[PDB]
Amino acid sequence: ADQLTEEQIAEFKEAFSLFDKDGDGTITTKELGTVMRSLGQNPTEAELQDMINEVDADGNGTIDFPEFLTMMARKM
Ligand SMILES: [Ca+2]
Ligand SMILES: [Ca+2]
């Protein structure tokens, strides 16, 4: 696997949009909490900040498409 599968990426892309309720191309902690809550997960503000920090490599403070791609890949 040189780069990645165009399908696996797409599936994650559609998942990125579902979480991007504002469509601004930037998943914030508030949006990540809404989703995690819909999946039955109750993350705290400190956990969302750290969960985002472990993957926020641009230092923007939020997860975008490529950043969310990496994060989901880490879940294996
Ligand atoms: Ca968003
Ligand atoms: Ca980031």
Swiss-Prot record:
Locate the cross-link: Glycyl lysine isopeptide (Lys-Gly) (interchain with G-Cter in ubiquitin). Answer: K21
Designated name of the protein = Calmodulin-1
GO molecular function per UniProt: adenylate cyclase activator activity; calcium channel inhibitor activity; calcium channel regulator activity; calcium ion binding; calcium-dependent protein binding; protein kinase binding; protein phosphatase activator activity; protein serine/threonine kinase activator activity
Q: What else is known?
A: This protein has four functional calcium-binding sites.
Provide the positions where the record notes the PTM N-acetylalanine: A1
Q: Output the Gene Ontology cellular-component terms.
A: calcium channel complex; calyx of Held; catalytic complex; centrosome; cytoplasm; cytosol; extracellular region; myelin sheath
**Where's the EF-hand domain?**
7-42, 43-76
Its subunit composition reads: Homotetramer. Interacts with MYO1C, MYO5A and RRAD. Interacts with MYO10. Interacts with CEP97, CCP110, TTN/titin and SRY. Interacts with USP6; the interaction is calcium dependent. Interacts with CDK5RAP2. Interacts with SCN5A. Interacts with RYR1. Interacts with FCHO1. Interacts with MIP in a 1:2 stoichiometry; the interaction with the cytoplasmic domains from two MIP subunits promotes MIP water channel closure. Interacts with ORAI1; this may play a role in the regulation of ORAI1-mediated calcium transport. Interacts with IQCF1. Interacts with SYT7. (Microbial infection) Interacts with Rubella virus protease/methyltransferase p150.
Key words of the record: Acetylation, Calcium, Cell projection, Cilium, Cytoplasm, Cytoskeleton, Disease variant, Flagellum, Host-virus interaction, Isopeptide bond, Long QT syndrome, Metal-binding, Methylation, Phosphoprotein, Repeat, Ubl conjugation
